[PDB]
């Protein structure tokens, strides 16, 4: 399996990029992002093409590709 780099855009326009395996559940990206922002994971919602990313969504399931963008909003 392969890895892709995703760009996570914060409410303040800051970015953290993540190298994620196509089969990894995106809960792990959500946890990492929230840890690095210093906020509870459940205070955030993560969107891809405006649609909510579930904990058990994989990049393969969502059709994600290299350099695709994820947006973070307050829950």
């Amino acid at each position: 399996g392969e890895y892709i780099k995703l760009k996570v855009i914060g409410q303040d326009s800051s970015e953290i990029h993540f190298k994620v395996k196509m089969t990894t559940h995106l809960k792990k990206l959500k946890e990492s992002y929230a840890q690095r922002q210093g906020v509870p994971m459940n205070s955030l919602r993560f969107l891809f093409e405006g649609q909510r990313i579930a904990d058990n969504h994989t990049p393969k399931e969502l059709g994600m590709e290299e350099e695709d963008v994820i947006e973070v909003y307050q829950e």
Binding site: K5, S14, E15, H17, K19, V20, T23, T24, K28, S32
Partner: peptide, 12 residues
Amino acid sequence: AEERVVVISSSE
């Protein structure tokens, strides 16, 4: 800000 790339482990 500097570029930030985090590698997510495949171990869950």
